[PDB]
Amino acid sequence: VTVDQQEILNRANEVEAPMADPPTDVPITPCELTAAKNAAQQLVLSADNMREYLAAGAKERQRLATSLRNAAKAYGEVDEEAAVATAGEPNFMDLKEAARKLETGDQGASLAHFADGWNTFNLTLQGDVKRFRGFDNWEGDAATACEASLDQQRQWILHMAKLSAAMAKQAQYVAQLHVWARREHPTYEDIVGLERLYAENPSARDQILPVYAEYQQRSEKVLTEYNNKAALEPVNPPKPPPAIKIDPP
Amino acid sequence: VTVDQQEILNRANEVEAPMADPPTDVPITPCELTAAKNAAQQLVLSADNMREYLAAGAKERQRLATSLRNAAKAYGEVDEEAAVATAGEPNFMDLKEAARKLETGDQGASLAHFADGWNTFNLTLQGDVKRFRGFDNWEGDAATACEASLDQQRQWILHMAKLSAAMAKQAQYVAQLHVWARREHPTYEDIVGLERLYAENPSARDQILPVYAEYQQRSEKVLTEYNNKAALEPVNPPKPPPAIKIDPP
Amino acid sequence: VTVDQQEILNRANEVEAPMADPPTDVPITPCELTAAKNAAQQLVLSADNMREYLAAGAKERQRLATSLRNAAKAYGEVDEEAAVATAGEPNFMDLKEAARKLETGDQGASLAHFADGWNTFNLTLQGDVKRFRGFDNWEGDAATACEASLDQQRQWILHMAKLSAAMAKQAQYVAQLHVWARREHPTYEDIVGLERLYAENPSARDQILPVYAEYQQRSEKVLTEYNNKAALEPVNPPKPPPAIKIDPP
Amino acid sequence: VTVDQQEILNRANEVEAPMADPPTDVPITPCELTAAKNAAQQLVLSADNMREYLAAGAKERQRLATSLRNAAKAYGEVDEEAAVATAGEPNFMDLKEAARKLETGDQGASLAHFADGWNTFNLTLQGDVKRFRGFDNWEGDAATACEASLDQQRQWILHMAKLSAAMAKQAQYVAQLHVWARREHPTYEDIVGLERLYAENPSARDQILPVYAEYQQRSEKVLTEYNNKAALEPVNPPKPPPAIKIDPP
Amino acid sequence: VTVDQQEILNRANEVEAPMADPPTDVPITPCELTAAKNAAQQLVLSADNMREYLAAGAKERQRLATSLRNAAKAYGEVDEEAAVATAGEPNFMDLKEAARKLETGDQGASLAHFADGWNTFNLTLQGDVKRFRGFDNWEGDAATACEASLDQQRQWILHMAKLSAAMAKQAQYVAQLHVWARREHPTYEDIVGLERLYAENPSARDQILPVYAEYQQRSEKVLTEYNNKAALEPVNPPKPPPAIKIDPP
Amino acid sequence: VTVDQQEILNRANEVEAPMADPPTDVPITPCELTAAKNAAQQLVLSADNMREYLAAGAKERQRLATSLRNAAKAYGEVDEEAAVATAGEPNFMDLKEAARKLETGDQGASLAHFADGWNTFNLTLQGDVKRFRGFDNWEGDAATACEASLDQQRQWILHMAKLSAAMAKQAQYVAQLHVWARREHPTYEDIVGLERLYAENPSARDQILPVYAEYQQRSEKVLTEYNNKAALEPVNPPKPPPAIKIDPP
Amino acid sequence: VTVDQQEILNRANEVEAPMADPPTDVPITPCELTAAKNAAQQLVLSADNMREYLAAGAKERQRLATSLRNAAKAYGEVDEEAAVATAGEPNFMDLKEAARKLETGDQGASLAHFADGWNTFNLTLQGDVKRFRGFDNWEGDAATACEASLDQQRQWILHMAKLSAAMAKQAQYVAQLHVWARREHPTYEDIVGLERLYAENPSARDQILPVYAEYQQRSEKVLTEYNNKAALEPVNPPKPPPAIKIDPP
């Protein structure tokens, strides 16, 4: 019905305008435990996957804009503008090492900043999908296939926003886990103090001994818990759907 | 059986009469927590999606009315009418900041007004579906395909009403969460009072210290809970089914 | 085997005899809460849907009777017979308003009458399905297709009876919810009495204050519970299956 | 292998010999509650459905016997042998009415007799399926299709026996529910006695009042429970499978 | 590869050698309760089904042996070798009758003997399946189809063994239920003794009365429990798979 | 690419080299209870099934080696190298018999040795699957089909190892059950001692009687538990996949 | 669009560059229990499977690089550069043996080192998948099929990383199980001490005897628990997807 070729060209420019940049904050391990460091490296890898697939999606949108320009060419002309030591003795050396690892590092501040950035990116991605709306005037069959391709791009972007939210939730979960670990695990200073209450009271040991044994058991329940809850699934984003290909007329 | 062309024309006008406008209330964050603000922005985005897809549905109904007019043209004539500082000291600065964020903002009044508007819209949408009923007299095959298309429009509208209800439930859930957070989290004035009971009693500290430690723990359980329950799924409405296309005779 | 054309004609009259009328009681909101009023309006809408689809089913049965008459015409002749103010003070104004809304209205009597009518209609519908039985003597292929069409009408009617039961259960559930809400929510007279025990004892307030705080908390747990359990699904009856179409011979 | 035509004729007579009659006991409501009466009417309707579908199955078996006679005709000759008043006062009038309804009627004796009859019918139906066994000597393709048709009749009869058991279980469930209701609901004589302990002791009321309030609450929990557990699903038996049709030779 | 016709003939004799006879013990009701008698009759019917289907399987194996003999005929020659009174008073007459029914009958000895026989039959059936093994030398396509048919016979026999185990478990379950019923239900002699402590102490009744009421309640919980757990599913064995048919050469 | 016929011949010899022999330990019943003996016989039968299917798999591998030799023949030449008494009295005779059965037999030592052998066989089977690896140099279509056939043999062997583990777990479960039964069931010597404390104290019986009644109840809970947990599923190994057949060239 | 043949050649070299070597640490049994040794052998076998399938994947990548070189040959020229004793007495000999087995061996240090190596390998594998990205300039149909083949290689590598994580979790689970077993099982020195408190106090035995019986029961609960939780599933990696085959031009 005297198709607006200009509408198609304008939508082609709008489709492949750059979207907001994903965050680039680096999540640091909250402590020196191996499970914590592995969780941080998993988060780094997942953020790398997200950035790579977002760039791939921008390439898909560029191809889609090209196909829309080719479809607009079927109505005429386009003016292309742009060109140990002892048996039986309390360890205290493993307990002390566990506490030392738990209290070294930023305790999860980096994780929280990471999660805030990706939650913001989830909202930002959801805000930028008017570029995939249907057309006002253009109809037919090039139009319907183009509309389906744009809606596929929209669904993929929404899925990417959901994955951003999931990765941010994972970072927050690891941060909460570290906070819980700091709370129930016995303090380094408490351990050192109880260790001096075993070299400054050979007499008193039958009060010091069960206390140590409590501390030991708590340490074991924390580290083990830390090791099991901290294993994270990698985020595995789907590849963006291939744009509809439309040859020049 | 001497088909009522007039019935088809009347149904065409009735199908694409404007439906009730969706609500336009803006949901405000109930507090200054990041989770609360992100929940409010998620609600804003979901309401935007709902309004956009409702407008798209009205366009689909306009196309359907055109197809019904074309089908009526097969029986003759239509008269087209219309044209920090220290180690080991109590923080009190993070606790105080948490309380300050919890008590600033409207505490959920805006959320409740938002939810009421969308619940009302759910009922309003369900009340406006007589326009998709079957025909009295028209039968045949244009009639049956047209009836199927109208029932598809009806099912899509019912699904949109259900989604309106779901979004309103989400707003109410966030409001209830904020109310719970206000209840169990320690008050700003209680925190300030306990902080003056630590600069006006250096003596008394071994009674003040565990009390603080209780407050701290409660603060941590509230904020964390607030952060996890407040993440909302976006509302993702299905695109309205394409109207049946019927060319002029 | 010398087919009883008379049996087919008699079954045609029996198929489209009018069934019992659905109930027409209007369910009133049991109170002035918004959730209660929305539940009542949802029930009104669902009853409207049920009445509309039952009328559509009667139209389907009329078409089926016509097809049976056409099938009877293949054996000969048919003789067509028929032609707030202060910070820190107790509210008492929200508590009092909540109680006032809870005790105004019929408290669920209308809901119970509604539910009784629809439960009776469930039984009534199940009692009227002998009209869809198979035939005594007529066999063949018109007969088998007609029998299948009648059984489809029977299954649809049974499903409608089941939906009637479900809607009645929903009305009873809302009535039971309102009864529970009346029980645990603090009485209006108790609230007014406790409010006069705060203007006639400035002295006594440190006994009055926690009592209020209990009442407040109970009010919050009731209203919130009322708001969440009272959201009802709309009843969405399936469209009656299209009758088998059989042209005159 | 010189097929026993006589075996086929004997099996034809055995297939359509009359099976045991279903029970005809009428289940009466155990009390005057609406839920109880509706449950009894549901049981009456389900028993009607069962009797109707059993008669339909006997008709199917008669058709099957005819098809077996037609199949026997392919080997030769068959000799066809056969030819309120105040605010704030205790009700006592709703409580008393509830007790009166609970204790009137047979208390479930009729339900138990109904259930025994249908359980017996379940066993009786399972005992009568030797008539659907495979053939001794007849083989081929008429024989295999006939064997499949007989096994379909057997499976349908077994399903009907299972449904008989289910309906009997429903009757027993309603009877057990009424027994539980009689136990926890406050007695009519206890209610009348407590009501005379409120007109023969205006003094004593602050001991009588909470007692009433207990009774009231118990009444509400019983009736409501009675109303919810007593809603029964209708028994919906499948139509018997159509017999294999075999024309005379 | 110079097929062993003798191996096929030997396997034909081995396939249709008689298997072990199923047990023929009759399970008797453990008591005089209706639920117990119905459970015993259900077990009788299930054992009848099992015996009937086992005989049918032996017929299938006989047909399979015939098909193997026909397949062996394709290599040459086979030498065919073989040729109440008062209101308000304690009942004591229903309680006494319940106890009398519970203690009459063999208390489950017959059930245990039944279950032992069928468990033994499960093991016996599993021990007799070497007759369905694959062939040593015979290969090709008659051989592969014959091997598939033999494996189908093996799978059916294994399923029948599993069903034998299930039926034995049902008998054991009913026996255990009766033992539990004997334990918690009040003894006949205890009932008679308490009934004489109500005609030999009109004085003492306010100690006798609650005791009776306890007994009554226990009786009701036992009989009801007995009625619900004792309903058994019929065992419904699948028909044996049809043997592969192979005509003489 | 100048296919290594020698590689195919070497793989043919490696494929059908004998695998490790399955264990041959016989599991003995741990006691004289019928459930224990039936469990032992079930284990014997399952081990028989496993040995039979493992021998069948070795035959399948021999056929596969033949097919590989035939495939190697397509490149030229292969040099074929190789050529009671009283009512109301305590029983003590059933209790004593139960204890006697529980303590006779090896108490599960044979079961543990059986389970160790089959767990070892699980590991042994998993260690011998390098013979099913893909080929170094041979490619094409005979090679790919041969590789698929070898991988099918590998998957079947892994499934057989898993079944070996499952059968060993069943043996360990029965052994643990017998150990539990020995612990909670009353000792034979304790029973005999308590029986002499009933013939050497007619006076003392009202202390002896409840004690017996405790023992009786414990006996009943053990034997019943022993009977229900000891029923074992037969191990039903899948038939090995048929080797790919490849005729000589 | 003047395809970059050089890009395809560079990607061919990048695809089949060697990936990081899997770890080669040998997991040792943490103790002398049979379940522990079997778990260690299962871990050894699973690590062997992982190493074998990783080498197979490298072979698949080498084939893929060859196919990419063949596809690059369709645009011209490639310069191939590279060329016991008593009844009734306490055992103490089984208890002592159980403790001795529990405390011998490295107690799980080897398991922890194994798990760390494989968790590191999981992260390492996820870091090396840029070699499977899509192409910059090459498009068409060889390009799209090649891109699909590369993405299949990527998905298989990600699955292998996930399996590495799972195997490491299994090793950590067995290590945690052994730690729990050491904690609740009675110490060897405690057993020896209690055994000397039975040869140096014949008097005292009625205090020593229940203590032993406690120890015995604890031993039984530990070993049994150790035996059941320690059975590990083998890791069964999928075979790498076959590379796309592309013949020279």
Notes on the protein architecture:
The PDB classes it as protein transport. The entry lists the keywords Cryo-EM, EspB, ESX-1, Preferential orientation, protein transport. It forms a heptameric assembly. The structure is a homoheptamer of 249-residue chains. By secondary structure, chain A is mainly α. Chain A has one domain (5-83, 90-229): Up-down Bundle (Ferritin). Chain A is 63% helix and 0% strand. The first copy, chain A, has helices at residues 5-15, 34-72, 93-103, 109-127, 142-184, 188-196, 205-229. In chain A, helix 2 (34-72) packs antiparallel against helix 5 and helix 4 (109-127) packs antiparallel against helix 5 (142-184). The radius of gyration of chain A is 29 Å and the shape is rod-shaped. The two termini of chain A are 19 Å apart. Chains in contact: A-B, A-G, B-C, C-D, D-E, E-F, F-G.
